Design a binder for these strands. Structure first.
Ligand code: NA
Ligand code: NA
Ligand code: NA
Ligand code: NA
Length: 326
DNA sequence: CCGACAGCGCATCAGC
DNA sequence: GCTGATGCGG
DNA sequence: GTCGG
């Protein structure tokens, strides 16, 4: 990837515009438009000279080219400058960094004078359970997880799961499975041969991880998906590890490997895999792969017993997760 | 000109 | 009390 | 905001 000094001013500006569209204007599609522009620019290996040069990239349109011309001539953007100083919009944008506080909650809080983390602390009875946990671990949740800690976390999850029932299958996916040096959370996919698409499995695993005090908190928990908080144990007289976000999902055995593939990513790798998949006559989603008949009617799901089976169906050589950046 | 931009589990709200 | 809608997350 | 039918 190009140095963050080639167009980092431009991609910083676009990412900031994206966050205000998401959190303040509640315009999720303008959020993704700015994000998409930021991404294609951050990959461009030339220092951008003008808005017209940028407009050649896909995702950069007329209005962003204009914003780039203004940023290149002035070193800022008038609209961005204004909204930064705006006490209301800046507080709304900020409160959404609390897990569980989205745009609507952030708006409501700011409306009634709740603007800062301190303000949230004095108003616990106005916070639901998830938001109390997001507040409690605000700084921890913004920290990244080095791969070494991820391995130690995986060690615990694989051990305790096998201890519950040795026939469980558990896979830590996400960027950690592709080889990344750091992670933002832990995403665990869980299955069991007793659970197919036509037939307490999760609770028992969550309970054991709480019993050994790995999982410390619960944001949500149902029969197929758990989202919560965990923390590695600290070495006697040394600094305690930050609390971390961990999700665990129970997925039917016959849909497991589609799930593992999908939740390994990367996002762009999935798109061209689906994009390759349909041109060969197959429809891949998170759950299943199916054949697309002459009219476009997808038939029944095809049996899948490993990731490679999916690659086999669509005439694609198996690519290792470390080669799934795209 | 103008619709798509993913779609789903869980917590909680809005309505009845 | 239940059913469906919405907010939120990743 | 951008793409494209
Ligand atoms: Na363009
Ligand atoms: Na956020
Ligand atoms: Na949030
Ligand atoms: Na056993």
């Amino acid at each position: 990837a190009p140095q963050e000094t080639l167009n980092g001013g431009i991609t910083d500006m676009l990412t900031e515009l994206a966050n205000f569209e998401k959190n303040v204007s509640q315009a999720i599609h303008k959020y993704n438009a700015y994000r998409k522009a930021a991404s294609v620019i951050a990959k461009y290996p030339h220092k951008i000279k003008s808005g017209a040069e940028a407009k050649k990239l896909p995702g950069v349109g007329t209005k962003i080219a204009e914003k780039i011309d203004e940023f290149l001539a002035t070193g800022k953007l008038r609209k961005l400058e204004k909204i930064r100083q705006d006490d209301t919009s800046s507080s709304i944008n900020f409160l959404t960094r609390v897990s569980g506080i989205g745009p609507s909650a952030a708006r409501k809080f700011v409306d009634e004078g709740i603007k800062t983390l301190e303000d949230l602390r004095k108003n616990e009875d106005k916070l639901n359970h998830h938001q109390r946990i997001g507040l409690k671990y605000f700084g921890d949740f913004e920290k990244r997880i080095p791969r070494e800690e991820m391995l130690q976390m995986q060690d615990i999850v694989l051990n305790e799961v096998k201890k519950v029932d040795s026939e469980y299958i558990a896979t830590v996916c996400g960027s950690f499975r592709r080889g990344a040096e750091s992670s933002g959370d832990m995403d665990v996919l869980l299955t069991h041969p007793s659970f197919t698409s036509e037939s307490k499995l999760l609770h028992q695993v969550v309970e054991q991880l709480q019993k050994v005090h790995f999982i410390t908190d619960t944001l949500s928990k149902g029969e197929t998906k758990f989202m919560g908080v965990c923390q590695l144990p600290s070495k006697n007289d040394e600094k305690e590890y930050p609390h971390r976000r961990i999700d665990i999902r129970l997925i039917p055995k016959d849909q497991y490997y589609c799930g593992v593939l999908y939740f390994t990513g990367s996002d762009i790798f999935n798109k061209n895999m689906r994009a390759h998949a349909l041109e060969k006559g197959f429809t891949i989603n998170e759950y299943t792969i199916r054949p697309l008949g002459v009219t476009g009617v997808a038939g029944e799901p095809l049996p899948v017993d490993s990731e490679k089976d999916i690659f086999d169906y669509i005439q694609w050589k198996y690519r290792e997760p470390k080669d799934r950046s795209e």
